[PDB]
Coordinates of C-alpha atoms in Angstrom, one line a residue:
Chain A
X1 CA -126.9 -120.1 52.6
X2 CA -129.7 -122.5 52.3
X3 CA -129.8 -123.6 56.0
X4 CA -129.6 -120.1 57.2
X5 CA -132.7 -119.2 55.5
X6 CA -135.0 -122.1 56.3
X7 CA -137.5 -120.0 58.3
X8 CA -139.3 -116.7 57.4
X9 CA -140.5 -114.4 60.1
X10 CA -141.7 -110.9 60.7
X11 CA -139.7 -108.3 62.7
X12 CA -141.0 -105.1 64.2
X13 CA -138.3 -102.4 64.4
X14 CA -139.0 -99.2 66.1
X15 CA -137.4 -97.1 63.2
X16 CA -137.4 -93.8 65.2
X17 CA -135.2 -93.5 68.2
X18 CA -137.0 -90.5 69.8
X19 CA -138.2 -92.1 72.9
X20 CA -138.2 -89.6 75.9
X21 CA -139.6 -89.0 79.3
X22 CA -142.7 -86.9 79.8
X23 CA -143.0 -83.8 81.9
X24 CA -144.6 -86.2 84.6
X25 CA -141.8 -88.6 84.5
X26 CA -143.4 -91.5 82.6
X27 CA -141.8 -93.4 79.8
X28 CA -142.9 -92.8 76.2
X29 CA -141.8 -95.4 73.7
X30 CA -140.6 -94.4 70.2
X31 CA -143.5 -93.7 68.0
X32 CA -142.8 -94.9 64.5
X33 CA -143.1 -98.6 64.4
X34 CA -142.3 -100.4 61.1
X35 CA -142.8 -104.0 60.0
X36 CA -140.2 -105.9 58.0
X37 CA -139.7 -109.3 56.5
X38 CA -136.7 -111.4 57.4
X39 CA -135.2 -114.9 57.1
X40 CA -133.2 -117.0 59.5
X41 CA -133.2 -120.2 61.5
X42 CA -134.8 -120.8 64.8
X43 CA -133.9 -123.6 67.2
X44 CA -134.5 -124.3 70.9
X45 CA -131.7 -123.0 73.4
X46 CA -130.3 -125.9 75.5
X47 CA -128.1 -124.5 78.2
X48 CA -128.2 -124.7 82.0
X49 CA -131.4 -123.8 83.6
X50 CA -133.0 -122.3 80.3
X51 CA -136.6 -123.1 80.0
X52 CA -138.2 -124.0 76.6
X53 CA -141.8 -124.3 76.7
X54 CA -141.8 -125.0 80.3
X55 CA -145.0 -125.0 82.3
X56 CA -144.7 -123.0 85.5
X57 CA -147.1 -123.6 88.5
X58 CA -147.9 -120.6 90.7
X59 CA -150.4 -119.7 93.4
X60 CA -151.9 -117.3 90.8
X61 CA -152.3 -120.0 88.1
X62 CA -150.1 -121.3 85.3
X63 CA -147.5 -119.6 83.1
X64 CA -145.6 -120.7 80.0
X65 CA -142.0 -119.5 79.3
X66 CA -140.1 -120.1 76.2
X67 CA -136.8 -118.9 74.6
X68 CA -135.0 -119.7 71.5
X69 CA -131.7 -119.0 69.5
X70 CA -131.8 -117.4 66.1
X71 CA -129.3 -117.5 63.4
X72 CA -129.4 -114.9 60.7
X73 CA -127.5 -112.6 58.5
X74 CA -129.8 -109.6 59.4
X75 CA -128.5 -107.1 62.0
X76 CA -131.0 -107.0 64.8
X77 CA -130.3 -104.8 67.7
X78 CA -131.1 -105.0 71.5
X79 CA -131.7 -102.1 73.8
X80 CA -128.7 -99.8 74.4
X81 CA -128.8 -96.8 76.8
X82 CA -125.7 -95.1 75.3
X83 CA -126.9 -95.2 71.8
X84 CA -130.5 -94.6 73.1
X85 CA -132.4 -97.2 71.0
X86 CA -134.8 -99.9 72.0
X87 CA -134.7 -103.6 71.0
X88 CA -136.5 -105.3 68.2
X89 CA -139.4 -107.9 68.2
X90 CA -139.6 -111.1 66.4
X91 CA -143.0 -112.8 65.6
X92 CA -142.9 -116.6 66.2
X93 CA -146.1 -118.6 66.2
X94 CA -148.1 -115.3 66.5
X95 CA -146.5 -114.3 69.7
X96 CA -143.8 -111.6 70.5
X97 CA -140.3 -112.5 71.1
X98 CA -137.9 -109.8 72.5
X99 CA -134.3 -109.8 71.5
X100 CA -132.3 -109.9 74.7
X101 CA -128.7 -111.1 73.7
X102 CA -126.5 -110.8 70.7
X103 CA -123.2 -112.2 69.4
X104 CA -121.3 -110.5 66.7
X105 CA -119.6 -113.1 64.4
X106 CA -119.8 -110.7 61.3
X107 CA -116.7 -109.7 59.3
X108 CA -115.0 -113.0 60.5
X109 CA -115.1 -114.9 57.3
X110 CA -116.4 -114.5 53.7
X111 CA -119.2 -117.1 53.5
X112 CA -120.0 -117.9 57.1
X113 CA -120.3 -114.4 58.8
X114 CA -123.7 -114.2 60.6
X115 CA -125.3 -113.3 64.0
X116 CA -126.7 -115.1 66.9
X117 CA -129.5 -113.9 69.2
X118 CA -131.4 -115.1 72.3
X119 CA -134.9 -114.2 72.1
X120 CA -137.4 -114.6 75.0
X121 CA -141.2 -114.8 74.8
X122 CA -142.8 -111.6 76.0
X123 CA -144.9 -112.2 79.3
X124 CA -148.6 -111.4 79.2
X125 CA -149.7 -108.1 80.8
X126 CA -152.3 -105.5 80.3
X127 CA -151.7 -102.3 78.2
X128 CA -151.4 -98.6 79.4
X129 CA -150.4 -95.5 77.6
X130 CA -148.7 -92.3 78.8
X131 CA -148.2 -90.5 75.5
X132 CA -148.0 -86.7 75.9
Chain B
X3 CA -201.6 -84.4 82.4
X4 CA -199.6 -82.7 79.6
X5 CA -200.9 -82.8 75.9
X6 CA -198.7 -83.6 73.0
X7 CA -198.3 -79.9 72.1
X8 CA -197.1 -79.0 75.6
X9 CA -194.6 -82.0 75.5
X10 CA -193.2 -80.8 72.2
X11 CA -193.0 -77.2 73.5
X12 CA -191.0 -78.6 76.4
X13 CA -188.6 -81.0 74.8
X14 CA -187.4 -78.4 72.3
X15 CA -185.6 -76.5 75.0
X16 CA -183.6 -79.5 76.6
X17 CA -180.8 -79.0 74.0
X18 CA -178.4 -81.8 74.9
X19 CA -175.1 -81.3 73.1
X20 CA -172.6 -83.8 74.4
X21 CA -172.2 -87.3 75.9
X22 CA -169.7 -88.7 78.4
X23 CA -169.2 -92.3 79.5
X24 CA -168.6 -93.5 83.3
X25 CA -167.9 -96.8 84.9
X26 CA -169.7 -96.2 88.0
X27 CA -173.4 -95.2 88.0
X28 CA -173.5 -91.4 87.7
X29 CA -177.1 -91.0 88.9
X30 CA -175.9 -89.9 92.5
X31 CA -173.0 -87.8 91.3
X32 CA -172.2 -87.2 87.5
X33 CA -169.0 -85.2 88.1
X34 CA -167.1 -88.2 89.2
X35 CA -165.8 -91.5 87.5
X36 CA -165.5 -90.0 84.0
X37 CA -163.7 -92.3 81.7
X38 CA -163.7 -90.6 78.2
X39 CA -163.6 -87.0 76.8
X40 CA -166.9 -85.3 75.9
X41 CA -168.2 -86.0 72.3
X42 CA -170.6 -84.1 70.2
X43 CA -174.2 -85.4 69.7
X44 CA -177.2 -84.0 67.7
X45 CA -180.9 -84.3 68.1
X46 CA -184.0 -83.7 66.0
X47 CA -187.0 -81.5 66.9
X48 CA -189.5 -83.1 69.1
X49 CA -192.6 -85.0 67.9
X50 CA -195.1 -87.1 69.9
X51 CA -193.1 -86.1 73.0
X52 CA -189.8 -87.7 71.7
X53 CA -186.5 -86.7 70.4
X54 CA -184.0 -89.0 68.7
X55 CA -180.2 -88.7 67.8
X56 CA -179.6 -87.6 64.1
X57 CA -176.6 -89.8 63.6
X58 CA -174.1 -92.3 65.1
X59 CA -171.5 -91.1 67.5
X60 CA -168.1 -92.9 67.7
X61 CA -166.5 -92.7 71.1
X62 CA -162.8 -93.6 71.7
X63 CA -162.1 -95.5 74.9
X64 CA -158.7 -95.8 76.6
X65 CA -157.0 -99.1 77.1
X66 CA -157.8 -101.2 80.1
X67 CA -160.9 -99.1 80.8
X68 CA -164.5 -100.2 81.4
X69 CA -167.8 -98.4 80.5
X70 CA -171.1 -99.1 82.0
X71 CA -173.2 -95.9 82.0
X72 CA -173.6 -92.5 80.0
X73 CA -174.6 -89.0 80.6
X74 CA -175.7 -86.1 78.5
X75 CA -174.6 -82.4 79.2
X76 CA -176.0 -79.1 77.9
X77 CA -174.3 -76.3 76.0
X78 CA -173.6 -74.9 79.7
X79 CA -172.0 -77.9 81.4
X80 CA -175.1 -79.3 83.2
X81 CA -176.0 -82.9 83.5
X82 CA -179.6 -83.5 82.3
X83 CA -179.9 -87.3 81.6
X84 CA -178.3 -90.5 82.8
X85 CA -178.7 -94.3 81.9
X86 CA -177.1 -97.6 81.8
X87 CA -175.5 -99.3 78.8
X88 CA -176.7 -102.7 77.5
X89 CA -173.6 -104.5 78.7
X90 CA -170.6 -103.5 81.0
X91 CA -167.8 -103.6 78.4
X92 CA -164.2 -103.9 79.1
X93 CA -161.6 -102.8 76.5
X94 CA -158.4 -104.8 76.4
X95 CA -156.9 -102.2 74.1
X96 CA -158.1 -98.9 72.7
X97 CA -161.2 -99.2 70.5
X98 CA -164.4 -97.4 69.3
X99 CA -167.7 -97.9 71.1
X100 CA -170.4 -97.1 68.6
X101 CA -173.6 -95.2 69.7
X102 CA -176.4 -96.4 67.4
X103 CA -179.0 -94.0 68.7
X104 CA -180.5 -92.5 71.8
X105 CA -183.9 -90.9 72.6
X106 CA -185.6 -89.1 75.5
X107 CA -189.3 -89.8 76.2
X108 CA -192.1 -87.9 78.1
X109 CA -194.8 -90.6 77.5
Chain C
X1 CA -139.3 -143.9 60.9
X2 CA -139.0 -147.3 62.6
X3 CA -137.1 -146.2 65.7
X4 CA -139.4 -143.2 66.3
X5 CA -142.5 -145.6 66.3
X6 CA -141.2 -148.4 68.6
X7 CA -143.7 -147.8 71.4
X8 CA -147.5 -147.3 71.2
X9 CA -149.3 -145.3 73.9
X10 CA -152.7 -143.6 74.6
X11 CA -153.0 -139.8 74.9
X12 CA -155.8 -138.0 76.6
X13 CA -156.4 -134.6 75.0
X14 CA -159.0 -132.2 76.3
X15 CA -160.4 -131.3 73.0
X16 CA -162.6 -128.4 74.3
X17 CA -160.7 -125.4 75.5
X18 CA -163.7 -123.9 77.4
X19 CA -162.3 -124.0 80.9
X20 CA -163.4 -121.1 83.1
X21 CA -163.7 -119.7 86.7
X22 CA -167.0 -120.3 88.5
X23 CA -169.1 -117.6 90.0
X24 CA -167.5 -118.7 93.3
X25 CA -163.9 -118.5 92.0
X26 CA -163.1 -122.2 91.8
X27 CA -161.5 -123.7 88.7
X28 CA -163.4 -125.8 86.2
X29 CA -161.4 -127.9 83.8
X30 CA -162.5 -128.2 80.1
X31 CA -165.3 -130.7 79.9
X32 CA -164.8 -132.7 76.7
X33 CA -162.1 -135.3 77.1
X34 CA -161.1 -137.4 74.2
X35 CA -158.8 -140.4 73.9
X36 CA -156.3 -141.0 71.1
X37 CA -153.7 -143.5 69.9
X38 CA -150.2 -142.3 69.2
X39 CA -146.8 -143.8 68.6
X40 CA -143.4 -142.6 69.6
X41 CA -140.4 -143.5 71.8
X42 CA -139.9 -143.3 75.5
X43 CA -136.6 -143.3 77.3
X44 CA -135.2 -142.3 80.7
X45 CA -134.1 -138.7 81.1
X46 CA -130.6 -138.4 82.5
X47 CA -129.6 -134.9 83.3
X48 CA -128.6 -133.1 86.6
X49 CA -130.8 -133.9 89.6
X50 CA -133.6 -135.5 87.5
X51 CA -135.2 -138.5 89.4
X52 CA -136.1 -141.5 87.5
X53 CA -138.1 -144.0 89.6
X54 CA -136.4 -142.7 92.6
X55 CA -137.8 -143.8 96.0
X56 CA -138.3 -140.7 98.3
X57 CA -138.3 -141.2 102.0
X58 CA -140.5 -138.7 104.0
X59 CA -142.0 -138.5 107.5
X60 CA -145.4 -139.3 106.0
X61 CA -144.3 -142.4 104.3
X62 CA -142.7 -143.3 100.8
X63 CA -143.2 -141.6 97.5
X64 CA -142.0 -142.6 93.8
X65 CA -141.1 -140.0 91.3
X66 CA -140.4 -140.6 87.6
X67 CA -139.8 -138.6 84.5
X68 CA -139.1 -139.5 80.9
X69 CA -138.3 -138.1 77.5
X70 CA -140.4 -138.7 74.5
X71 CA -139.5 -138.6 70.8
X72 CA -142.6 -138.4 68.4
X73 CA -144.0 -136.9 65.3
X74 CA -147.4 -136.0 66.9
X75 CA -147.8 -132.4 68.2
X76 CA -148.7 -132.6 71.8
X77 CA -149.2 -129.3 73.7
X78 CA -148.6 -128.1 77.2
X79 CA -150.4 -125.6 79.2
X80 CA -150.6 -122.0 77.8
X81 CA -152.3 -119.0 79.4
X82 CA -152.2 -116.8 76.4
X83 CA -153.8 -119.5 74.1
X84 CA -155.9 -120.6 77.0
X85 CA -155.5 -124.4 76.7
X86 CA -154.5 -127.1 79.1
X87 CA -151.8 -129.9 78.8
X88 CA -152.1 -133.3 77.5
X89 CA -151.8 -136.7 79.3
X90 CA -149.8 -139.7 78.2
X91 CA -150.5 -143.2 79.7
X92 CA -147.4 -145.1 80.6
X93 CA -147.7 -148.3 82.6
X94 CA -151.2 -147.4 83.4
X95 CA -150.3 -144.2 85.1
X96 CA -150.7 -140.7 84.0
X97 CA -147.7 -138.5 82.7
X98 CA -148.3 -134.9 82.3
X99 CA -146.5 -133.0 79.5
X100 CA -144.3 -130.2 81.1
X101 CA -141.9 -129.2 78.5
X102 CA -141.7 -129.2 74.6
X103 CA -138.9 -128.5 72.2
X104 CA -139.9 -127.7 68.5
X105 CA -137.6 -129.3 66.0
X106 CA -140.3 -129.5 63.3
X107 CA -139.8 -127.9 59.8
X108 CA -136.1 -128.1 60.2
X109 CA -135.3 -131.1 57.8
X110 CA -137.4 -133.4 55.5
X111 CA -137.0 -137.0 57.2
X112 CA -135.9 -136.0 60.7
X113 CA -138.4 -133.3 61.8
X114 CA -139.9 -134.3 65.2
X115 CA -140.8 -133.1 68.7
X116 CA -139.2 -133.7 72.1
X117 CA -141.3 -133.6 75.4
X118 CA -140.4 -134.1 79.1
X119 CA -143.3 -135.9 80.9
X120 CA -143.5 -136.2 84.7
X121 CA -145.5 -138.9 86.6
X122 CA -148.5 -137.3 88.2
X123 CA -148.6 -137.3 92.0
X124 CA -151.3 -139.2 93.9
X125 CA -154.0 -137.1 95.4
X126 CA -157.8 -137.5 96.1
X127 CA -160.4 -136.1 93.7
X128 CA -162.8 -133.1 94.2
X129 CA -165.2 -131.5 91.7
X130 CA -166.4 -128.0 91.6
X131 CA -168.6 -128.1 88.3
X132 CA -171.2 -125.4 88.0

């Protein structure tokens, strides 16, 4: 419906699910990454000690943590060790948001079936590769 | 004091063939602190006691690494030249460092 | 709308975002500070252990802590380490109030898009400069 499609964002799904552990023990993420276009709705998540755009003071400097809730009809998936697949990524404001939680309301009713996700801004860190 | 002809007779036998990049000064020990895999490089025949590279060389640097010096190696794995880059360059992610040209002088 | 613009206050934005670390390691804040005039609405923030105008008794003496919530259509920003910019300042009653939290409700609806911020009164301390 109209309100469920107010926002348009990009989603990076690792289509391949062939991640494995090297002969040295390091983790190697699935190789084939694919970009997609999706539509949904993004709002701040107000609950308990959740931190939306909260500035954090540390001895090392300053951080910024954010988290949101997303309503959409697209089936995004989080990490699953039994099915052996990794989570998706959602691009908001040019930054990455990793899908951490999911709530399956699909197949409940005709016109109001949807999904809910809690997406957390990814922390800043340097990059390293282990590919075999 | 060498003449131009002797200089040209000399430089023709140097035959550098590859280039490697280091982060620590390799003058004292070129075997250590390697950061990138060897890459091919070509030179022209000497003139005026000088040899210059014949084309650009694209070197791939791994993520989170730094490069500050270089070194040239023969066809038989011996270091014959060392030097410093224009800037110490830090690569946030994998990229290409472009070698415009390099020359060796006897003047 | 009328109720969103009941109050008028001054905002100090550090327009330049060229803060850096000295050759000695000290922090140097961005230099170009600019004053602006904005309009919004300020109310006390009632939630949990939040302290509005609460007197605090300490062995060293007495303190006063205050915090408020601000509704406005102006886009104020907090500190962000990835974008490398500092937070804004809001002048209330002649004292400084640093923006610590943000909630993005913009682009949601036509006539009711706005922003929410939690601003905390800055503590009293002496001044020191490290400028290179």
